[PDB]
Write a protein that binds this DNA or RNA. Sequence first.
DNA 1: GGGCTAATGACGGCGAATACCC
RNA 2: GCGGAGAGGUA
DNA 3: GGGTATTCGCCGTGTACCTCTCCTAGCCC
Lengths: 619, 1320
Amino acid sequence: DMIKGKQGRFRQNLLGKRVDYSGRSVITVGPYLRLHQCGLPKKMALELFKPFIYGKLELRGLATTIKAAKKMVEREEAVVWDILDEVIREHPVLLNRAPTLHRLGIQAFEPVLIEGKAIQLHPLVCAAYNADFDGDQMAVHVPLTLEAQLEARALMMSTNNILSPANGEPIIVPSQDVVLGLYYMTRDCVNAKGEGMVLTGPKEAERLYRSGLASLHARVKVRITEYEKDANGELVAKTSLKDTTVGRAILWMIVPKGLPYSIVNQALGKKAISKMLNTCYRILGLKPTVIFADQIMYTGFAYAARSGASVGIDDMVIPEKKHEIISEAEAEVAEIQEQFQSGLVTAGERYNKVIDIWAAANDRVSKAMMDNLQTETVINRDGQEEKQVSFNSIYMMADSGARGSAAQIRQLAGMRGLMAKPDGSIIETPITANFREGLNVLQYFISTHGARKGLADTALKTANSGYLTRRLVDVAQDLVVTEDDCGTHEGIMMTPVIEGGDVKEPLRDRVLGRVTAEDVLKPGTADILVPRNTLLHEQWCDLLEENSVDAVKVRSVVSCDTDFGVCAHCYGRDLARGHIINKGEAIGVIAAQSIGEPGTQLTMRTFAESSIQVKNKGS
Amino acid sequence: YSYTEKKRIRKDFGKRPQVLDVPYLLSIQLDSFQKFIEQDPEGQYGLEAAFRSVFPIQSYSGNSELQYVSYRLGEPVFDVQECQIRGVTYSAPLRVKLRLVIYEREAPEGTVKDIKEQEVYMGEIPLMTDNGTFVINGTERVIVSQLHRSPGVFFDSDKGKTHSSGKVLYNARIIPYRGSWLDFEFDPKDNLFVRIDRRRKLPATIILRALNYTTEQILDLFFEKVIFEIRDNKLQMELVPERLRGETASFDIEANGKVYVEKGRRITARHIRQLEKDDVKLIEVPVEYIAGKVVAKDYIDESTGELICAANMELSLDLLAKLSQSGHKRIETLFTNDLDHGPYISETLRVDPTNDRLSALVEIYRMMRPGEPPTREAAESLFENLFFSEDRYDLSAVGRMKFNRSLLREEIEGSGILSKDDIIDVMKKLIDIRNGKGEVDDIDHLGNRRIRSVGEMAENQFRVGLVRVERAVKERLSLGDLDTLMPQDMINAKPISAAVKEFFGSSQLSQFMDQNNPLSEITHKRRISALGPGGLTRERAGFEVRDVHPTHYGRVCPIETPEGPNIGLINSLSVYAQTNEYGFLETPYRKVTDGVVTDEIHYLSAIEEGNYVIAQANSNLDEEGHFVEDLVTCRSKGESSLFSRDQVDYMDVSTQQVVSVGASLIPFLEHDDANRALMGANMQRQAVPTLRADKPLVGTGMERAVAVDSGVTAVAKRGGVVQYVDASRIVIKVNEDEMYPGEAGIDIYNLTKYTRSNQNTCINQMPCVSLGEPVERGDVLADGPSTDLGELALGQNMRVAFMPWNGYNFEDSILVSERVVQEDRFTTIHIQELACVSRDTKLGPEEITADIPNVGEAALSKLDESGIVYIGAEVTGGDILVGKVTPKSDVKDSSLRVPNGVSGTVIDVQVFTRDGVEKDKRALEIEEMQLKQAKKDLSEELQILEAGLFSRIRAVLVAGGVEAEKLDKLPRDRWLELGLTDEEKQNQLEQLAEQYDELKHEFEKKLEAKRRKITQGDDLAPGVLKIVKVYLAVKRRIQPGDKMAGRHGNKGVISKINPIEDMPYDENGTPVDIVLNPLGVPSRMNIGQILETHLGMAAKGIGDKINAMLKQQQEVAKLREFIQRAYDLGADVRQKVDLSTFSDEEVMRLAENLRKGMPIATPVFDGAKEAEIKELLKLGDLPTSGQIRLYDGRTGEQFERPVTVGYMYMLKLNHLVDDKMHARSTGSYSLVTQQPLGGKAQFGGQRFGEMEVWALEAYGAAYTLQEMLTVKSDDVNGRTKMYKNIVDGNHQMEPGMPESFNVLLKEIRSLGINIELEDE
DNA sequence: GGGCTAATGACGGCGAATACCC
RNA sequence: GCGGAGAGGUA
DNA sequence: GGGTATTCGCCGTGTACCTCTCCTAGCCC
Ligand SMILES: Nc1ccn([C@@H]2O[C@H](COP(=O)(O)CP(=O)(O)OP(=O)(O)O)[C@@H](O)[C@H]2O)c(=O)n1
Ligand SMILES: [Mg+2]
Ligand SMILES: [Zn+2]
């Protein structure tokens, strides 16, 4: 019993030890931080770094012997805090959050001493940690040896991990306040203060906005000098007059050199900001992306605060035609029930009909509410009137992708749809009321069943997923990229997965970063488009998009020839960094972690075929 | 209104009239334990039942019987408070009256001796406090009610997952309250198997065999007979037509001259009608048809005697021929209709190897006790005691009720033991369901789930103790001599007290009262746990049990349940629900007499609820109990729909009855998603009492119910007038109405000042009333922790603004203004207890003296001569709380020190000495402090009684000659020594003198008793001389990192404290207190916080208006007009408060209390609609939209798009960053695996778990993982070398091999496995 | 207080051990 | 005073 | 006897953290 089992041994005491020089505390926002740092309480920092403190105290001669150093640390005199500041200077600490799902659950930061007893965590990294400031706690470890320090600062530091190891996409994308602020800043309005005035640059745009002589969003012609690296790494300035908002110019001030203006010119929601960061990374590189992300955070926070976005009861508008829709659906259900009691239709048919008419009524009311709420600002230009995408605070939070989806908006302002009873069957009458209105005992009770079932599911799923990912990391642990190139011709034929109606997943992402097994030819023989095994980076993939290549044979890890591990080429590039995999990397654990994190994460997130219809004109 | 209500009335929204008032919320615990004690004649639930169940104890045929008369609960020696102080269990001695009778050995039974014992002592039973808790070792415990399967019989299906070939195999399980279980199940091959509780599955018929039933008797009892007559030739059958239902015809069914059913055509309904009206009884049938049937009776050859065919033998042509030649005219076959009536018992009989009763009993014994040769009497006794012995096997009153209801018998009251008809009926119903004319039961139905409260579980444990002592006494009375011993050497209390103290102390359902909040206490007591004994385990439990059932309506709260691993297995009980006589759950409903909705309330259980159509509470009733709408919304079989006016049988009592108390406290529950409501209730039970709790501006009205029903308030027992008010006691002179005629006196309420709650929070009571105010019975005299004037004040209500403020409220985190800390409103007092124990070692007793080796006099400065800190001294981590020396004699100190990093003031010290040493200083101070108070209380009572006696002496002296000039100027004590003319009056004076003496003598014995109780050594564990306890009190202020929450499920970590100037401010200049993120609303669909903010802004606006009108002190008229217009506010409200009836002084006091903001009361589902909030906002002169324009305190610039501001009631949860925060460099390591300790109490390091290891492996981080694995935790030489190396200013390190691996090697080698570390 | 002795409320998956049908 | 049971809670 | 079903029994069932009580047992002098 001591050996076997979870609690006993190997799992408990030989793969799961309990380190020294470690601490724990509650995490907090700390917006002012740089991406590569973390607020660390003075007293915790002193406790952790005690032996470092003693060493530095003895070197400076402030203490004759080690016991005097201990006594001096236990009094905590000004000299001790000065020594702590000096030793902490470049020493990085590891921050970890309890469910270390993937490798981004542990990251290294440079600490900044602060008052208080809570650890301050940079907002942008919360998404990587799945961290929320609602009582989440984090542990903080101190790498001791010199080798540990280099590893933390080079391999593990927060700024070095911006791309997820699972898929290539960025991890540090702005989450909710940043994206809301940026959205508010970039969206335009038909008529405002400073409508249609011509600005010599973004700098006077800020002059105008901060002085209150122009609205943060108001259509204007501004002269801007964008830079584009079209040559071999040289930047060429093109300077012209664009039609934009004041806000978009103000935002343009931050944007690093290499990027086209177009990037910011749009509404700038969640997707737009994420792809902005993505492009900034692909074009400029790491360091500009880091600094640009920090700038994005700061400007988003600032202008979100200046926006004053709030949520009043009237901000969520009940569609005016809701009551009619509900009365109509009730009349229809009454008619169908009466026509049932006479016995011309079975119970199942009546069930299906009622469920379908109620679903249709729900969609109708939802669409009516979304029309009402979405584009309701009928504000006037100089003369006649016009209509535009509203400034309803709940709508901006929905549309920007900061919080909420259309579904939750429906649950607030529409009817909250159909529910499922224990066995999975759907109740005939739906919950017509919404949270702006009040539910009644029955409707509440039903939604209670829903919520309880979801919470129980999350807990059971969490256990099952934790088991599955544990098995995965176990099986694939020993696999390492050992050789540079095995030199095999074998490979897997990669196609775009076209499930039925359309292209669920295109070629470019499916092939991106894989080396080819053999050269693929143009639609005309002897027209080699890609040499023998080449890593397919964005440029090659785009080139394939320009041509009409349909299927590409790419070297796969399964067919790799290397003994006792895999070779770099058969694997490919994809990493938190951009380049071909480096010899020595443990791909087994990264693969297992990347395949298991979502399953546990998704459960928490949850908390006919009669005729074919060709979608596009073809043979 | 009552006086506490007239002090501060709460504006109540809410349209429907409350017919039933909230019951006493702790009814469950009190009523159950009362039933437990309950000296009662007829043995019902109760200790009495246990005694009568186990007694009378007769010897193993030794003819020495033991009888029970009655029991008495001794008076507890220690009251609740002193018992908590002294760390002992609060209990009562249990005394039972017995008689030992020895009947003559060889005579008609008659006692040759009967001796009656002088109330023999059989151990201690803990008593329950007035509030419904138990003090078990000076800690307040609660015994949570347990939901579990009720005794009876249940028919389950367990389908779908049965061998994956369909074959839904049913089973009937008979579960008693006390006794072994019975199980009948099927198999893929439709053979019915019995399984005694949890063993192997035998063919069921053996049990039928054990019941003395012969095979022919069984086939009679189960199968319907079929008659075969042979008349002149070939097998004619007596046929009952209705039996043919659903049967393809196998032969040509001709009758009375006409073929009716052609051979091959299935019998149709037309044919059925034809044959029925024709009256066809008998039909001749081909022998092929009979060639397959089965024989019922055992037909022997009457002529020769040799048996031919046996009972339940398949028929073959040869057997039919033998039967025909033997002369059998009447053949009895079985009716096996493969559609309806299957051959289930037949096939079991074929598989059943046993034939006689004896072989069946033998097989049973070899299943129960496998391997030992069974002897006849052993098997007989085993089987008899198994299911039919009254003592061993008892179902229950409830078990029998469920059993009889399940088998559709009119009789409800049966015998506990399983009679044979019971078993046969159970198997009949099982095979019945197997044919398909019946439904299986669902375990999750509350009609199938019974609640065992405290008293019942205690009774079970006590019976178990009794069975132990009973076996013991049985043996001792047999072996030992009969007539010498008296009935107290014979009976041992040890097993009884062991079982009872085991249950109360060390049990799964006996757990600490969650005592940091009044709601926490009250909700902990009214809890229903599905865990514990005979309960499903939390981790194992499948979702189906956890999922809410339609039966929970009005019985269990659907939304309040821990969201941890045991979600759904806790289920706090609803507001109005109660427990039945049989332990089920019932909820009140208003009866409906066909048109009018009457006012008589009936409590309905699950089953009774199932039949009727119940109307909702939020149904519109106009002035005469008639529904306004023609089609109203009801529920009939667990599903709601529309029913007609003249169809509803019952109606919900009130909207609140669905939800628990915790959920009922949330305002605007109707607008919160169930998930976030769940989290809101769960957290709200975690709020810590602040220094001055105030009130919710937006409540639900339940606050007073919760505060009063919890024991934290001090409530008047007999109404009167407040005579004396102090911040320790309230003394009230009773009103003459309630005043007892004989020996009344006055009422005294001692309050409790800062004491330690279970969670280390403060429990302090403040007086509400002032000198000379009249109080009525049931008013709130003193406010408990986090309660104000009778109302629950869990947290405090502050001005919040929903906006993102430079990402300091980024995630659920919260921004707070320095004004909140300045006004010191979220600072709580906590209280730690520390204990220093001086035991007796064999090297010599340790000492508590202040002479402590090698400590500087700095440490002693704050210590007295005895070595204990002074009360009121401010200490810090590491300071010496008390001085102790370890004998060797000294040179080493075991003195207790303040734990590292905790600093507060020593408010109290206590000393408990078994030695009772003459001269302990601290003991002297504590004794004098307790004594002087006791003296004061006794002196006050004595002085009042003396004043009364003197008044009576004056009233007698005035008769017989008025003397008022001389008398009034000489002192009163000079009235007894005076005299009067010798008459009856002198006799009355002698009477009063003897009464004076009697009052003195009663005082003296009470004083002596109190002083003996104070002085006595406070019974310590063996080996411990004495113990000194020290209480520290610490004022913890809110700081960044603490957790704050609302009532609606919104959470957060306090992220930053802003200066007052930086915070947003309205035009008027008032800054907000908290800046709360809006983005937490849309995805977390808790809209209740937004409406709460709006209504709170309206309420504080009105309160502000009243403050403005009061500060200028206009006149009573204006205040009355404004407050009346406010209290009315529209119509359809059940308030109708009349300000005019209240006196001007009362109205002025009400304005003073409302000046801080008029409190609203929105009930959960019968709440305040938006329009009413709009009206209230308008009355206060505030924006109707509930949003205000705010100015940025840093920049001064206005925010575009005005923001929602208003007052919301926020709570500081017990999760305090300073408690959470922790770090270590180096410290103590563990013994076996040399890794550093885990935890916070001992320094302890964080656990770098396997997931974290994987994280490091995902990086190329080999050295970090390496050091983390060996140097940081487990490698001894590595850790010490690394400490020295770091101190030396070098960071190199050597890794070595972890000690835990070596432990692993040694442990594996300890098996028979040689595992070696190789070398080459 | 100290000293001495020796029951029942998981479930699935998987692979081995009989049950049985030729 | 290393441990292990039981109970509750946090994320 | 050899292959196919069927019963049978073992093994597993997410991490990190924070509070509290209670711990070899029984009987007699
Ligand atoms: N029993 C549990 C409960 C929670 N957790 C973990 O604690 C976090 C809470 O997520 P959460 O769902 O509470 C908030 P989030 O995921 O960010 O979504 P939202 O903010 O839009 O609401 C998650 O990372 C869980 O993995 C756990 O390991 N075990
Ligand atoms: Mg969180
Ligand atoms: Zn390869």
